[PDB]
Design a protein around this ligand. Structure first.
Ligand SMILES: NCCOB(c1ccccc1)c1ccccc1
Ligand SMILES: NCCOB(c1ccccc1)c1ccccc1
Lengths: 491, 166, 95
């Protein structure tokens, strides 16, 4: 436990700072064997390092998505697990919480290791070491396979799970690609199917709230009608407070999330902002302030925009929303930066000119900026002002602005969004599936007020018999698949 | 189209003023239907198939998102521009039509001095333009480029199937 | 003719619910041969299932566009058609 071995930034190599973990991470097949079966003093296999990692944890940590690294880690992981079963079966190595409280599988999920993660997520052995298997197969009557994936440490019923870690705790750049693996893609799809009723109920409740909010905002002061207006107003205030509390509790209960991925969610921010603006609008109305209407109307616009959070319970539209987000975040902010630099330069230029003659156009910076933006939206006034003494200079400056902005930058923006839409096609699907996963995981636990009862997916199916007497049981996710490539080899 | 035509004639026999909209809708729809026939040709039939794929793939999503945006911003602008210091944004229909004008290159983006929320209305319009004209329309061009590229061989096969059906 | 064998949604595998159709859909080159040429009681090849499918019908039904599945279906289809011609040419199985 020094400085080179400890995990940090710079010159380093983490291997668990145990001689056995070093041998395992260094492909020392024989040294580990001698350490384990030296008669003088056998080497323990459950031994933890100062950080809490075991040899299996360490093999995960060094794991990288390189094919050779993945092959090495997989081989040594399997072999060491088999050896651990052989030497001391009584102790289950796969379930050892390090100081962070993560098992090797959860650790692989959090640390982004995908190849070792998927391998651990679906592995099977022969008759011997069979209990050390996550994927099973009950019967193969015909070409069908009843695959039983172990749901241990991966179902959402437990306090902390691989699904929750991937959704919220993982900070990997492309964690959206781990929620499309076999067990996860099927379990998540089943959970989504079970939750479609509640997703649509949330959508319908929010849509009703926005309808009421639109009706109230459309009919406001500039009997029965007054009473209906009042009840609608109080309903809007209550709904705004409800959404505010929901978002606040989403953040407090999940206060360790913003730093991982600020823009992954980016609708809880927008929902929070909309609810805050609504409640703030109401309170200022109580204060009788003229700044009510802008805030209430901003809340209206933002809520109607937020509806497109819900529009992505559909394959067809959710990928569209994801791809809108990618377009905005990739090739719209650059365009806005460059465009606004151009526009400010040309606007102050035109204002500087057109100030000496021979309803004044380009009177100030705001007017010139608005005229240039008009050019952007297809209604720029491109005339030869005869009154100002620099007619030609102003016209040439406008023509240069048009060439640089309308002909070059806007069409190039179309080209860039073509390129980005083409680039993010499969990743859009994966990211949408991750969005569904996140929504499912949030829907599983109830609202901020309702303590929802968990529903533990999978079947308590007795699989094999452990190296003991009375047999064992285990929760598995039962999956049917029609396969012929495997079936021709079982004969 | 045939139903609208016959129904138009019978309503004329009834001397109803709702004749002309139905007859004119029949006219428009029949002229559109001519594109059924325009695909007896390799050159134009694949074009028709690929128009259909564009509409059904990346035009209805755009319309849904665009209309949500437009309704939100239209009711917003109507809510504002209702208190001063020929009224623009008089109702929901007028505001919606002005926003669609923005969509078609005819949007009036001015600084209304009469209404007391000049800046808020202008910023709201600018946000609508950025979200709709700059983002969504150009993104629609990008999406239709992507769909046209995606369905190139399938367009030929689907056109051959259309010929088979005919 | 039960519930698992009948075509439906869920746990299922359709093979025509005939022993010969099962052998054919299960790549039992030899079982079908014994059923067809057992002297004690030869197994008919035109026999239909409750749904009306024959061995060829069922063998198509399991067909899927997987290259290995397609190869298996093609091979067994051709071989079984040849056997049908060999045993009882008088009857045309394709129809
Ligand atoms: N459909 C746009 C809804 O609101 B979007 C938007 C609204 C206000 C601020 C910036 C953008 C946003 C959210 C979803 C995708 C990307 C941007
Ligand atoms: N080429 C468009 C002709 O009319 B299309 C059209 C007309 C009325 C309603 C909706 C669309 C239509 C038919 C062909 C392909 C897809 C849509």
């Amino acid at each position: 436990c020094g400085r080179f071995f400890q995990k940090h930034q710079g010159t380093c190599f983490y291997f668990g700072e145990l001689p056995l973990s070093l041998a395992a991470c260094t492909k020392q097949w024989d040294v580990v064997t001698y350490l384990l079966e030296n008669p003088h003093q056998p080497a323990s296999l459950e031994a933890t390092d100062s950080l809490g990692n075991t040899v299996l944890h360490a093999l995960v940590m060094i794991a990288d998505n390189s094919p050779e690294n993945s092959a090495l880690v997989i081989h040594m992981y399997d072999s060491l697990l088999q050896m651990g079963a052989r030497l001391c079966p009584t102790v289950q190595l796969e379930d050892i919480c390090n100081h962070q409280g993560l098992t090797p599988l959860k650790l692989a999920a959090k640390e982004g290791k995908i190849e070792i993660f998927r391998h651990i997520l679906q592995r099977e052995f022969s008759g011997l070491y069979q209990p050390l298997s996550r994927k099973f197969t009950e019967w193969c009557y015909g070409p069908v396979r009843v695959s039983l994936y172990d749901l241990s440490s991966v179902d959402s019923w437990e306090k902390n799970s691989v699904l929750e870690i991937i959704a919220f705790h993982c900070k990997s750049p492309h964690r959206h690609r781990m929620v499309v693996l076999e067990p996860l893609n099927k379990l998540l799809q089943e959970k989504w199917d079970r939750l479609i009723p509640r997703f649509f109920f949330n959508f319908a409740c929010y849509l009703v709230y926005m309808i009421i909010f639109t009706i109230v905002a459309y009919h406001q002061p500039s009997t029965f009608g007054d009473s209906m207006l009042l009840l609608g107003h109080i309903l809007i205030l209550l709904g705004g407070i409800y959404l505010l509390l929901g978002q606040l509790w989403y953040f407090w209960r999940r206060r360790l999330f913003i730093w991982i991925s600020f823009m992954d969610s980016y609708f809880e921010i927008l929902f929070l902002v909309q609810a805050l603006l609504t409640v703030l609008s109401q309170v200022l109305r109580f204060v009788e302030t003229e700044w009510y209407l802008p805030l209430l109307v901003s809340s209206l616009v933002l809520g109607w925009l937020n509806l497109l959070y819900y529009t992505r319970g559909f394959q067809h539209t959710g990928i569209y929303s994801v791809m809108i987000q990618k377009v905005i975040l990739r090739d719209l902010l650059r365009f806005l930066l460059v465009y606004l630099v151009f526009l400010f330069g040309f606007a102050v230029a035109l204002v500087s000119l057109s100030r000496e003659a021979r309803p004044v156009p380009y009177g100030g910076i705001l007017d010139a900026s608005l005229e240039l933006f008009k050019f952007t939206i297809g209604m720029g006034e491109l005339a030869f002002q005869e009154q100002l003494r620099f007619r030609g200079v102003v016209l040439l400056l406008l023509l240069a602005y048009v060439l640089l902005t309308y002909v070059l930058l806007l069409n190039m923006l179309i080209a860039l969004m073509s390129e980005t839409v083409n680039s993010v096609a499969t990743d859009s699907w994966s990211i949408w599936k991750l969005q569904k996963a996140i929504s499912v995981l949030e829907m599983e636990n109830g609202y901020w007020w309702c303590r929802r009862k968990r529903h533990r997916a999978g079947r308590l199916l007795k699989v094999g018999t452990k190296g003991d007497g009375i047999p064992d049981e285990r929760w598995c996710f039962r999956v049917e698949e029609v396969n012929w490539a495997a079936w021709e080899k079982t004969l």
